[PDB]
Amino acid sequence: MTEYKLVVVGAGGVGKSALTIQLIQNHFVDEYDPTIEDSYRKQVVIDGETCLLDILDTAGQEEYSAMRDQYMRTGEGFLCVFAINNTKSFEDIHQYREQIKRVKDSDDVPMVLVGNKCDLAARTVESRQAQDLARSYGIPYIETSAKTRQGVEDAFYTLVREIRQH
Ligand SMILES: Nc1nc2c(ncn2[C@@H]2O[C@H](COP(=O)(O)OP(=O)(O)NP(=O)(O)O)[C@@H](O)[C@H]2O)c(=O)[nH]1
Ligand SMILES: [Mg+2]
User: Fold this and answer.
1) Strand order through the sheet with 77-83
2) Residue 52 lies in domain
3) Is 31 annotated in some ligand binding site?
4) Could you say what the effect of mutating residue 83 to T is?
C-alpha cells in the first residue's frame, strides 16, 4: 500500500508529540517529555485509500539539528507546528520552512501550517496573522488542539491530500 512519510517540525514545546500521540493512541499527553526522534507507523483509510502513515516526530531543540535534517530529507510532507500562545514559536516558522526548502532542494513541498493549543484562552498569535503567513507560502493553515482533538485528523489528512496533489 501507499506509504506517506510525514515529518512534524517546529519549536520546542509546541505540541508536536501531543498531536501525533492524539492521532495514533487517542490520548492527550500532559507530561513533560522532550523528544529526540521518534517514528510512528499506522495503517489508515483516507478517502477510501488504504495507506500507511509513517510519521517522523522531531526535536524542537537546536542541538539535534543534524539529526532533524537527515529525517527532513526523506519526508514527503511536513507539518510546521507553532503554539498560539507562543509568539517566538510563530516567528521561528520561517526558519523551519527555510530549512525544509534547503534540505529538499525545493521551493514548494507539501506542507501545512498548524496553530496548536487552540484550547487556550491566552492567545498571542491571531488566526488572521497565521492565515496571512500561510497564504504567503501557498499552504493551508489549520488550527488544532491536541488536548480536545479539534483539528487533529484535519491537519494530518489535509497533508496527505496535499501530497496526493503534488
Ligand atoms: N493546552 C494544551 N497543551 C498542550 C497541547 N499540546 C501540547 N500541550 C502541552 O505542551 C507540552 C509540550 O508538548 P509536546 O507534545 O511535548 O511538545 P513538543 O513539541 O513535542 N516538545 P519537543 O520539541 O521537545 O519534543 C506538554 O505539556 C503538553 O501536554 C494543546 O493542544 N493544548
Ligand atoms: Mg516532542
Assistant:
1) 37-46, 49-58, 2-10, 77-83, 111-116, 141-143
2) 2-165
3) yes
4) GTP-binding activity reduced by factor of 30
Q: Count how many domains the chain has.
A: 1
CATH number at residue 63: 3.40.50.300
Taking the CB of residue 30, how many other CB atoms lie within 10 A of it? 9
Rounded Cα distance between 110 and 81, Å, is: 14
CA atoms of 12 and 62, how far apart (whole Å): 9
What are 94's three cell numbers?
520561517
Ligand-binding annotation for 118, yes or no, is: yes
Residue 87's Cα: distance from chain center in Å? 17
Within 6 A (CB) of ligand 1 lie 12-18, 29-30, 32-35, 59-60, 116-117, 119-120, 145-147
User: What's the N-to-C CA distance of the chain in angstroms?
Assistant: 18
What was the experiment behind these coordinates?
Answer: X-ray
Binding residue per annotation — 26?
no
* 79 burial via Cβ count (<10 Å: 0-12, 13-18, 19+): buried
Compute, in angstroms, the gap from residue 135 CA to the centroid of ligand 2.
Answer: 27
Give residue for cell 516567528: 91
Asked if 140 and 112 touch (Cβ cutoff 8 Å), the reply is yes
